[PDB]
Amino acid sequence: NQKLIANQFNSAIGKIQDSLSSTASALGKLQDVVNQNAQALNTLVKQLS
C-alpha cells in the first residue's frame, strides 16, 4: 500500500496548512502566553499612577 500511504500522508499535510491558515485559535496556547505576559507588564506600569 505504499502509494496509498504516501498519498494519505501528502493529503494530511495539506490539511494541516488549511487549518493553520484559517483557524486563529489553533495557536491559542502560544498566544495566551504572550497575552498573560503583556497583561502582567501593563498592570505593573499602570500601578505607577
Binding site: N42, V45, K46, L48, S49
Partner: protein
C-alpha cells in the same frame, strides 16, 4: 499665577533638566506632531508621567 523666576532659552534634541510651569523632569525635548487642543496644556502616558 507664577513665581518670580526668570525663564531660560529652550534647547531641543538634547538631554536637559526641564521645568515647565513648575512641572519638572529630565528628558529630551523634541518637535512633535501631537495636536493638543487649545485648552490642553500637558499630555500624559499610561504611567501618568508627562
Amino acid at each position: 499665577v507664577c513665581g518670580p523666576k526668570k525663564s531660560t532659552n529652550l534647547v531641543k534634541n538634547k538631554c536637559v533638566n526641564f521645568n515647565f510651569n513648575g512641572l519638572t523632569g529630565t528628558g529630551v525635548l523634541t518637535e512633535s506632531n501631537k495636536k493638543f487642543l487649545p485648552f490642553q496644556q500637558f499630555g500624559r502616558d499610561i504611567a501618568d508621567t508627562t
